Amino acid sequence: SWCLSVHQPWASLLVRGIKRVEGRSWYTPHRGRLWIAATAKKPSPQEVSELQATYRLLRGKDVEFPNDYPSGCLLGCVDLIDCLSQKQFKEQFPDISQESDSPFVFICKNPQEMVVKFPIKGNPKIWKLDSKIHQGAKKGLMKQNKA
């Protein structure tokens, strides 16, 4: 029922599993399912090319970027497994600590993308989804439920 607004292209990278941590300046006790919404801010082609270049070298040839990075919509979800200080992240996750230098690092698992993405307006930090879109969001985690 809780959501985080994230700029594109990072937002789709998170729900596809290409980006595995998310850095923020603030700590959250939230754990478990976290919906991911893309903000309205449209990314520039340079941003998209520079990030896709980096992640292609981090993740290899098998990486599958989305064809398009839709803005202003609910995208899917992840499991927020832990939120660590940057110090503990560097110490405890040495294989991936280069992937964020933010003061806090959200460790994300089990990404799932929605079969149909629904328009939505963001809010700060971790915010509560409206019940109607939450219901449609849940049904949308299975490709067969597309209508």
- Residue 9: cis peptide before it, omega within 30 degrees of 0: yes
Q: What one-character DSSP code corresponds to residue 17?
A: T
Task: Report domain extents, the chain.
Answer: 2-145
Deposited resolution, Å = 1.9
Angle at 79 between CA 20 and CA 45, to 5 degrees: 40
Q: What is the DSSP string of 42-111?
A: PPPHHHHHHHHHHHHHHH-TT----S----SEEEEEEEEEEEEEHHHHHHH-TTTGGG--SSEEEEEEEE
Cα–Cα dist 143/81, whole Å: 25
Fold of the domain spanning 2-145: 2.30.130
Q: Is 110 exposed, middle or buried (0-12, 13-18, 19+ CB in 10 A)?
A: exposed
**CB neighbourhood size of 126 (10 A):** 18
Distance of CA 80 to the CA centre of its chain: 10
Q: Give the phi and the psi of residue 100 in degrees, each rounded to 5.
A: -160, 135
Which amino acid does the sequence have at 72? G
